[PDB]
């Protein structure tokens, strides 16, 4: 006695009309079980009448939650109203086949004239629609049922877990891999700036060993022949004259064995030196982002030891969750290769490891961690410090 069938797709709601009713008493017979698999036989049973796709991803998640709780959405109420014919509440009622029994009572309240069936006979028809899927839609634009499930699957799952970006700590792991990487490349490229400008005027490579000081000076002193008292004051402003280099560069610029390089060659040195200047500036910007981000993610661990040290500890564990799950002993050897936590010296190291473990647990399993416990935990370490 089934006349209409409701199927919920990730893309939308699909309503079918049952043309022929399959045998009821012989439901368990093999041949009626096979016809569900065979599309040629199945298409004789049901036909698609309506399909109302969801407006977008946001609507799909809302209706998935409503369907999960056995509720009727405003979209579902619309499609059923458009299709199902009006019938008496008592004398005769239109029959609708639904997958979920919990959804049955809700549909009855909205539509008193429709009777919901979810017995085994209904399940078989629902199984067949799920089995053939898009083939029954007669080409109607149902997108792709496999891609929408993946997006909706992640959406539905995280909504129940209340997964948030605030808990996210992978931003910390990447930025460490940036900071040490930037330091290596800044040093590497800075050294190359020395050699290229070393050919033109080698003596400067001796004058101001500080690597970042060369580039700004090399950006200024492009050609050693250019030597003016005003320029001397300008380069004197760069850094300080206490070292006396401002006078030395002018003197050595007057007397040096450096071979003059071409204008194009100098164009590269300043440009290559300019690149090194940007990376150091970016590296400082990122290091500040790490300081801020760590306080948000792991305030207890950050306060106890420091933002950078805690981040390296998190990366070595692979995740803040991994660090929390490790025992106190494992954490101590986690930072025993870089001496992060470093006979009496070892005792403080082992003691600090235990405190760091507890600080991570508070950070890891708290929705909005505070630094109140990290501060007292560090203070407890401070009291331990003078005692030994």
């Amino acid at each position: 006695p089934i006349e209409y069938l409701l199927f919920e797709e990730p893309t939308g709601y699909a309503v079918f009309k049952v043309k022929l009713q399959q045998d009821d008493i012989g439901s368990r017979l093999k041949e009626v079980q096979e016809q569900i698999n065979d599309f040629g036989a199945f298409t004789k049973l049901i036909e698609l009448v309506s399909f109302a796709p969801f407006k977008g991803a946001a609507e799909a998640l809302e209706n998935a939650n409503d369907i999960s709780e056995g509720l009727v959405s405003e979209s579902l109420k619309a499609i059923l109203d458009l299709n199902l014919p009006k019938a008496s509440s008592k004398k005769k009622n239109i029959t609708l086949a639904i997958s979920d029994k919990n959804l049955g009572p809700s549909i009855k309240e909205e539509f008193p004239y429709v009777d919901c069936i979810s017995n085994e006979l209904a399940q078989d028809l629902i199984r067949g629609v799920r089995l053939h899927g898009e083939k029954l839609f007669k080409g109607l634009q149902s997108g792709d049922l496999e891609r929408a499930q993946l997006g909706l699957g992640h959406a539905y799952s995280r909504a129940k877990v209340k997964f948030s970006v605030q808990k996210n700590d992978n931003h910390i792991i990447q930025a460490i891999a940036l900071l040490d990487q930037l330091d290596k490349d800044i040093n590497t490229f800075a050294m190359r700036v020395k050699e290229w400008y070393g050919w033109h005027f080698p003596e400067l490579a001796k004058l101001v060993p500080d690597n970042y000081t060369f580039a700004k000076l090399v950006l200024f002193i492009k050609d050693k022949a250019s030597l003016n008292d005003d320029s001397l004051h300008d380069l004197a402003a760069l850094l300080n004259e206490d070292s006396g280099i401002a006078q030395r560069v002018i003197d050595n610029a007057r007397i040096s064995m450096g071979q003059d390089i071409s204008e194009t060659d100098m164009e590269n040195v300043c440009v290559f030196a300019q690149r090194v200047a940007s990376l150091a500036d970016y590296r400082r910007q990122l290091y500040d982002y790490l300081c801020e981000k760590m306080h948000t993610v792991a305030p207890n661990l950050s306060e106890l030891i420091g933002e950078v040290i805690g981040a390296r500890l998190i990366s070595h564990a692979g995740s803040l969750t991994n660090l929390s799950k490790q025992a106190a002993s494992t954490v101590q050897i986690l930072g025993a290769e870089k001496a992060l936590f470093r006979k009496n010296k070892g005792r403080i190291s082992r003691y600090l490891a235990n405190k760091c473990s507890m600080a991570s647990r508070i950070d890891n399993y708290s929705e909005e961690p505070s630094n109140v416990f990290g501060s007292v935990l560090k203070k407890q370490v401070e009291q331990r410090l003078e005692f030994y």
């Binding site: 929390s324 799950k325 490790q326 025992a327 106190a328 002993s329 235990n354 473990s357 507890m358 647990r361 508070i362 890891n364 399993y365 708290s366 416990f373």
Partner: protein
């Protein structure tokens, strides 16, 4: 809803602490949260007992994640003061674990509690 969950009732806590004390005498009890984590890693724990008033409660909330990954029963008792006293040590104990041993004298009591904890979960 509360982070410490499930919390044993008064009747069950009394039974749990009985097993904890007898385990302490028979050297089948590991005391402290750090010990509990190790036993879970070695997979040598009948079940884990934790204190629900640990200050803060978060410093032992790693153990439930380890346990239910390993399918080990766990339960929270209201008092760390009582748990330490039952454990047999002169300090409060926030977490303890019963070691796996099929040759123990208190096998029946341990499995008796373990079945109850499983029903609670």
């Amino acid at each position: 809803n509360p982070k410490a969950f499930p919390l044993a009732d008064a009747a069950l806590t009394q039974q749990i602490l009985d097993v904890v004390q007898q385990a302490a005498n028979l050297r089948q009890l590991k005391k402290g949260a750090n010990e509990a984590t190790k036993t879970l890693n070695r997979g040598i724990s009948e079940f884990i007992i934790m204190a629900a008033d640990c200050e803060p409660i978060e410093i032992l909330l790693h153990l439930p994640l380890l346990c239910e990954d390993k399918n080990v029963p766990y339960v929270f008792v209201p008092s760390r003061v009582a748990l330490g006293r039952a454990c047999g040590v002169s300090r409060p104990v926030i977490a303890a674990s019963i070691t796996t041993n099929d040759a123990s004298a208190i096998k029946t009591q341990i499995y008796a509690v373990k079945d109850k904890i499983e029903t609670l979960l």
